[PDB]
């Protein structure tokens, strides 16, 4: 006669990275109709906070070498693009990394902030090769959507002079891999209904339930215009 | 005739865009046509795009 | 006459001269794009007859 | 964070039964996710007698 709405059942975490959420009450074929449409919005327009601007000590540009570190500055910038962090009430925060002495500099050697959560304290930023070699750096992290390469981030100019502010490419996004599988779920009485097993993969900076909601949020907002059609211009 | 010379060295970083020529080792040339989102990318059952 | 590398260039603003030092040569590390001045240079031409 | 909702949408009808709507601007890839998910529900799960 009329219709049936779904809901999320067990969201089974496996790793901080990857997990399996499930949606039980799906009518015929809606598991596919959703799973791809959700995969679409899941992989792309999900908010994430990735490092943007990095100003270091003795370095004018990304093409130099710091005396005392076996990583070229360019390679250290690249390591940062893969640093996974999460903030809460700040939309951009600048982290100060300080360390010296022979050994690896991980992501746990930074300075903690109220909103700072380092999801991978073992993540390698660079090594340090000489007893009294010291590195201080200002790391500017912002939050956003999509992929903003460092190139498109030079048109506002208007005196971004600080010669030592090295921009990196913005990867803003948590999602790594999204896969959905629909196996037929029979609730005891209905002819045939289906399940939705959505298997995702994450950088550990977003919990599954938060994500899938804001995902679905955008949908009706885009369908909003879609419902009635005022021929607007 | 030359009094002084200033040689400046620029390091440009170019990535990839439609029009670059790419080829495998087997003599298959190619010119990248479109740069596609991961959303439109073919994926296998496990969900890993290509 | 001889050509000068001086930072004094007819008809140019400070935004141009921003990226330049006192001597007329771009600082090391200044990221630049099309049209930016790498080296200030000036050649003598007297009494233009405008 | 915040998102894009389109504007300018012209439905030029060719008879009461058939029509071509067009709706721009949609962010990256949103054209297929909508276009397909609605094609799905129109052809498949729509009520009719």
Cα distances from A12 to residues A8, A21, A200, B2, C45, in angstroms, run 11, 6, 11, 74, 79
CB contact at 8 A, A22 and A198: yes
CB contact at 8 A, D1 and A226: no
CB contact at 8 A, D43 and D37: no
Neighbours of chain A (3+ CB pairs under 8 A): B, C, D
- Nearest one of A64, A66, A136 to A96, comparing CA atoms: A136
3-state DSSP call for residue C41?
Answer: coil
Q: What is the DSSP string of B3-20?
A: ---------------TT-
Dist CA A132 CA A69 (whole Å): 11
Number of Cβ within 10 Å of residue A205's Cβ equals: 19
Cα distances from A176 to residues A44, A120, A171, B26, B38, in angstroms, run 10, 16, 11, 32, 10
Cα distances from D23 to residues A182, B42, D11, in angstroms, run 31, 26, 9
What is the total residue count of chain B?
A: 50
Dist CA A144 CA A165 (whole Å): 20
Tell me how close the Cα of D29 comes to any Cα of chain B, in angstroms: 7
Dist CA C41 CA C3 (whole Å): 7
Record: contact D37-A37, CB cut-off 8 A: yes
Q: What is the DSSP string of chain A?
A: -------B---EE-SSSEEEEEEEEE-TTHHHHHHHHHHHHHHSS-EEEEEEEEEESS-SSTT---TT-SS-HHHHHHHHHT--EE-SS-SEEEEEEEEESSEEE-TTSB---TT-EES-TT---EEE-STT-EEEEEEEEEEEES-B-TTTT-S--SS---TTEEE--B----EEEEEEE------SSSS--EEEEEEEEE-SSS-HHHHHHHHHHHHHHHHHHHSS-----
Residues 6+ apart with CB under 8 A from C37: C9, C12, C16, C19, C20, C26
Tell me how close the Cα of B50 comes to any Cα of chain A, in angstroms: 11
Record: contact C32-B10, CB cut-off 8 A: yes
In chain C, residues with a C-beta closer than 8 Å to the C-beta of B8 are 25-26, 38-39
Tell me how close the Cα of A103 comes to any Cα of chain B, in angstroms: 31
**Residue D40 forms contact with A (CB below 8 Å):** yes
Resolution in A: 3.4
CB contact at 8 A, A181 and A152: no
Instruction: Find the CB nearest B39 among A40, A149, A177.
Output: A40
Record: contact D28-B37, CB cut-off 8 A: yes
Instruction: Find the CB nearest C39 among B3, B6, B10.
Output: B6
Dist CA A95 CA A68 (whole Å): 22
Dist CA A123 CA A30 (whole Å): 40
Method: X-ray
Domains with residue ranges and CATH for chain A: 1-47+173-233 (3.30.1360.10), 48-172 (2.170.120.12)
């Amino acid at each position: 006669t009329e219709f049936l709405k779904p809901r999320l059942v067990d969201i089974e975490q496996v790793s901080s990275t990857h997990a399996k959420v499930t949606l039980e009450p799906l009518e015929r074929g809606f598991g596919h109709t959703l799973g791809n449409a959700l995969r679409r919005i899941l992989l792309s327009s999900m908010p994430g906070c990735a490092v943007t601007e990095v100003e270091i000590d003795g370095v004018l540009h990304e093409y130099s070498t710091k005396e005392g570190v076996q990583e070229d500055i360019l390679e250290i910038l690249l390591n940062l693009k893969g640093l996974a962090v999460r903030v809460q009430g700040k939309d951009e925060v600048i982290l100060t990394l300080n360390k010296s002495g022979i050994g690896p500099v991980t992501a746990a050697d930074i300075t903690h902030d109220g909103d700072v959560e380092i999801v991978k304290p073992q993540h390698v930023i660079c090594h340090l090769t000489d007893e009294n070699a010291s590195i201080s750096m200002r790391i500017k992290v912002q939050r956003g959507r999509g992929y903003v390469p460092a190139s498109t981030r030079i048109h506002s100019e208007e005196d971004e002079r600080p010669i030592g502010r090295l921009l990196v490419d913005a990867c803003y996004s948590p999602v790594e891999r999204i896969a959905y599988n629909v196996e037929a779920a029979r609730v005891e009485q209905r002819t045939d209904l289906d399940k939705l097993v959505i298997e995702m993969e994450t950088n550990g900076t977003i919990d599954p339930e938060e994500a899938i909601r804001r995902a679905a949020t955008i949908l009706a907002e885009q369908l909003e215009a879609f419902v009635d059609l005022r021929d607007v211009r | 005739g030359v009094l002084k010379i200033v040689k400046v060295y620029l390091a440009v970083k170019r990535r990839i865009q439609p029009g670059d020529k790419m080829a495998g080792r087997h003599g298959n040339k190619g010119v990248i046509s479109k740069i596609n989102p991961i959303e439109d990318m073919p994926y296998d059952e496990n969900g890993t795009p290509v | 006459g001889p050509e000068e590398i001086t930072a004094d260039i007819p008809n140019v603003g400070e935004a141009a001269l921003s990226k330049l030092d006192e001597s007329g040569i771009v600082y090391i590390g200044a990221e630049v794009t099309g049209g930016d001045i790498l080296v200030g240079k000036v050649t003598p031409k007297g009494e233009t007859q405008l």
